[model samples]
Target chain A: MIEWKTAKEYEDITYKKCNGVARIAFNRPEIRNAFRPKTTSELYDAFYDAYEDPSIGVVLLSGEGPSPKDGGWAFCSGGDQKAHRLNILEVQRLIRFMPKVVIAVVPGWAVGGGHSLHVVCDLTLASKEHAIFKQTDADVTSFDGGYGSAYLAKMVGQKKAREIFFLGRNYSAQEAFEMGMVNKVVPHAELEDTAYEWAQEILAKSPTSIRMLKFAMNLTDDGMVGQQVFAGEATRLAYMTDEAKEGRNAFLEKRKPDFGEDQWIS
Target chain B: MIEWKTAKEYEDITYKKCNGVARIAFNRPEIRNAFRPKTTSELYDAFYDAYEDPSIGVVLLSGEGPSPKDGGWAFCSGGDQKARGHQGYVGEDGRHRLNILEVQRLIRFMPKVVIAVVPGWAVGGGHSLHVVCDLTLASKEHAIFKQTDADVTSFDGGYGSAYLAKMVGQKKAREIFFLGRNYSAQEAFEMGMVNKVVPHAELEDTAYEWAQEILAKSPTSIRMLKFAMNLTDDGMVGQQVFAGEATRLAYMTDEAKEGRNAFLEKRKPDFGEDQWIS
Candidate 1:
């Protein structure tokens, strides 16, 4: 029962521990759980801490808001575009060294960077009722969709990756399952339970072995190796952008940060 | 047209050239076109020349006799079980760097290897002419086949080079594509095109020995650089494998005379093309 002020720069992020699993919920229900820079940094710190803590064998991320009360739609609507964009490399640098097996639990719309977070995790579980998993810009800008594309392409194929990215189509839980995008999609009522079940399964394995296997599996592909290099390159670029500033500002403001209306710009 | 005797050693092989394409036909109609060592060596030599020669761009391979005539029943029956049982890799040094792309073309029946040679009696016209020129061809033995699925999986995702290229990384591709057993017939064919096959022993020998014989040629004469030209066409395997092959082959063709004379001789001659091609 750790209470904090709303202005503490992370009112949107709530952290708690149950058993061995550390659960972090995105608490900004007013904006449909959109991600602001403050929230992202908070998440970054939370995941970073959980990854480093030996006691925390598993980490679960989910959405929190009033939407869950009436079963209103939306898990994580994705990054606060107005907060600013982090170059792919910057984003990778933050999570690339994470050693924990991160699991994203989704009950509603997981879109854009929301989906990227879902895809980047070691495993992902969603409610079957969770619809509209996509990475799209409100403006048709040709920005890369973070690390998810590379991993997804390898999991599926170039054709599907192209179809998903270029078309910006939303995917049903079943479709994501068939494509091996989501490991499992349980009933909405059982989403948390199913996620916990998987977390327990991972916990059953030797932690060291799990970490080593994840590393070994990632090293098999040269594309992923190349990604590390590209990610590094992007980090420098991201460190200097207005997007990063916007991200920080949006977090402080605790509002739905707008990315600007440039619908015809692309 | 240059004619050569068909010895018992070369019994399972039949070779001809049409246009610029060298057509290497696996003629073991009896054993479903399975490969034996001797026949495979000859087939390998033909492709070695095609891979080396500038005149040849496409090599087409196919199965001959019973299977094709019997209503497209089988294409390739897969690796010889006897050979597999014998632990084929034993005592083999320098086998690590086998040229998989060339092997795939030979095994799958691509006509990209043929060069202009004495014309032979032609069969299958027009609609079938383009079929002969396709870089890849499949036999009835190749259709609806289910032999290599297990091997593919067990090998930590065999077709290592091609798989790596397509996925742009070894680790990721291996993690996903590596399976435990041969694919079912419906699965394999649906996955991609089949090349060809022969009687069990014959098919095994043809695939293995042909690769060996092709390596025996002089580097310069065989148009060894041609493989380099086609190497980068896929643009997926990254530039490493392609650049490595190109650099080595370029040096061999530029400095080696046995390689040069073999080219001028317009005939099969031993050179150092294998070192470069692989």
Candidate 2:
């Protein structure tokens, strides 16, 4: 597996980037990776470092376990019981706007706001030991701003989203995958390797495709607002140097299109 | 196998009500029950009756038959394409009436549980109606869901595409709408568009069972939650809807107290006297 250079470090989180992947691990397995406002604060700062790194194509987040040597164990248990509600809403906003390939490497017990990060991401990869996923304890998700319900309802049907949220069900990783929530589930031991493999795969793709499509999909969910955003994206894409023409020319010339993987776009 | 009374009937459709369930079936199995403007008009009137009939808790929509006596067959095959034009379907009056759109809104807006029991080909606009319903049950062998060949501009209603995307993801919804490919009942279930797929013989009974389960729940809760999901996702409307329901249950209603009392008493709560809900 490719390792990331330690770009930035924090007390509750580790932010590393190398080989085009920004690997962010949530520290504080002592409390099962519970989010203190400080934890989120550090993430916000660390994520900024990841965001600005042009070399970074994918953002991979995972729960940390006990001990720096242990790698990581528990997933986010939830933030402060008081502000748990607000933190999730904030993270939801962050992931969408981050505009990169965000993948969650969940190992186990994706509880509270922890899994919400994974749920809204572009794709989620899980570990075999993954036991529980909930917006929060009990049916409280119903009371915690209605965003989770709608987001979930999109993946699993509305009926199931309601049942899962209202009944406070803990889904096995298999169940999560079947519900269209998880992208892939691998053995717990291979979690990091699997995530790195996915990151490398994403690195090989056209960043433009991932970039525009992410924005397009985000807007697509919001009806007219999304339609307008996507329309604007199209308008914007058309104005860019004819990559399509170059792509074909390159094909005929037996060369890679000058999509400017390392070049600039208008 | 419970039958409904012919509360109202149309030239090409049957509207019946029985045992707290209101059933509507497209009867023109010949054109595969292809909807005409008149077919929609009578359904409008019949549905108005169903909506007002307090005793009715479930509205079941289905396509009527292969008519064992004869060869005529079809499910809801959408409208006559030759008759379709701007404004909607051209009826005997030679005027375009956006009839199916009206029918779709009624299904979605109605507070009661709407169940689609699809028997055969549910195509184009017909396919969309089943999707917009709260729940769907389909025939194992006969049911096929498809979007008709045309540009994406045309549809059953805005909600047809939107709700389909809501049930399945945008990727598949676009695939279904843009490509107009047919999906088997099993495929539809896997996509989460259909709640249950049963043998054609069992479709009605399965729908009835679903209706009974929904009916036993708190009506106000169901209606409010449905309304919430129907309106918005990230917008203020959805947020407000959730708040309204929360306030109603947490503060406004006596039903919540009854629920607690019933739990303590170890019996079903009698919410018959719900204040605002009634």
Candidate 3:
């Protein structure tokens, strides 16, 4: 088993390999395990290492412990907004290149960029009492919430993808399952065990064959996926508007963003 | 309300057309208005003409009169197997080519071919023949059903190009639809619909061949009609199959000779298969 300590930038991150599985945990519970730029780089390195390593067959992504402020509120509050401003591209590069079967195990709140990370995984297994998934940039800066639209559309469709992106609402675990976003939804207590069980099932199959099949399935609909990716990029670019900025500012100030009338101006 | 005369081949066989709708009727009440080879050919010609003609929009195919023998028996009793030995490819030209739009209609079974024939022979009558009529229709032996069966046996690779072009594209429609002989009821049901299972013995094989032959005579019209027919039906072959199956099961009886014959034949016999399965 190999162990890698977290850097100062990734203080809350840890990586280890056990039983042919690579476990990457978001260990920062102090700030609700929110991810920063350094953490994102660490995650990228971890995933890249796991994918390239011959001994590792599956990668398990999870958060460490409960947040002190929210009382077991979440595994992740989401991407670090400051990090979003500085290292958005790095975050995208990390997720886009993962070669092996990546599974996200959520035992608590997977908000904002956290939710984006969850959706980006090859498979998602969640707890019934998992934290609410908030995929929005209603904070101090405008974040595109990662490159999530195209993949989401392929899994569910255009309409649902729009709702997830535009509305920026918190989606429950059960709702995610119904929408076919997550593969399995289990009890909060059994989330880790259930995820491991699933990993074991995948491990039983030939790794080469699994990779080939996944590739083939994706190739068949490459055109559709391409279109979706384009749409996603367009939506993200559109969010660079004044309205988006205003919304983020209001959110940081802990107040509502006025869209319809000038009640605050008077 | 334009009237066209029925071209009779056998005593029970007839064809005519009205209002861009060509109608073919099985007149053999004694045999539950079942079709024989000659009737099958005449009926085929009627549909083929409708497919060929620019004037025809909807081809109303049905069985004539209340069957004195079977009571509301059938719309099409498939092919006449007695005519099987006589069955062969119809017309002088062996191949038929259609445009993309026409191919789409044929896939959807929208009767676009019938609408193409502006001037042609009337296939059958309109009213008394209407009650026991079945709106549901299946594809020809080689094109749709055969393709489906072939898909199961892995022998349908050759037809992949044509199937893909007509249905959607090779990627989406290829593996699922083919003409190999191994189609199971469940598979068919999943892919589309299995109207009913018809016996091989009850079908008039020669009739369909003859119908194809008559269809071959007006080569230009047949080509054009086929093209249009393909266009109208687009992306609904499976759905149409489901609908056809429902109509077939509900209106058709189980104890009928054609039904039994289809069972005995193992392979769906033409007339019997048509009566039960189509």
Best by TM-score: 2
lDDT digits (tens) for residues B61-164 of candidate 2: 88888856565435688776777777778888888888677777677667677898999899877887788788889899889888984653576536668678
TM-score of chain B of 1: 0.44
Clash pairs of candidate 2?
A: A64-A72, A64-A73, A65-A72, A65-A73, A219-A226, A260-A263, B32-B74
DockQ values of all predictions: 0.01, 0.01, 0.02
TM-score of each: 0.41, 0.46, 0.41
Q: Candidate 2, DockQ to 2 decimals?
A: 0.01
Worst 10 residues of 3 chain B by lDDT: B116-125
User: Alpha carbon lDDT of residue B54, candidate 3?
Assistant: 55
Ranking by TM-score: 2, 3, 1
lDDT of 1 by residue, B1-278 (tens): 32323322356667654333445666655555555444445666766655554434444455555454454333334333333323231112323222323454442232133321101111111111212222222222332323233443323123333433332344433332343233322332234322332343344234333433332332221232333333334234323333333233333332334545766988544432112100
The CA lDDT at A224 in model 2 is 55
List, residue by residue over A172-226, the lDDT tens digit for candidate 2: 7788888888888788889889989998787765444456567555654666554
Every model: iRMSD: 24.6, 27.0, 29.2
Best by lDDT: 2
Could you tell me the lDDT of residue A186 within candidate 1? 84
Write the residue-wise lDDT of candidate 3 on B80-132 in tens digits: 32332322313224322112123223323432322111011111111112211
Q: List ranges where model 3 is wrong by over 4 Å.
A: A1-10, A82-96, A138-146, A220-266, B1-96, B99-278
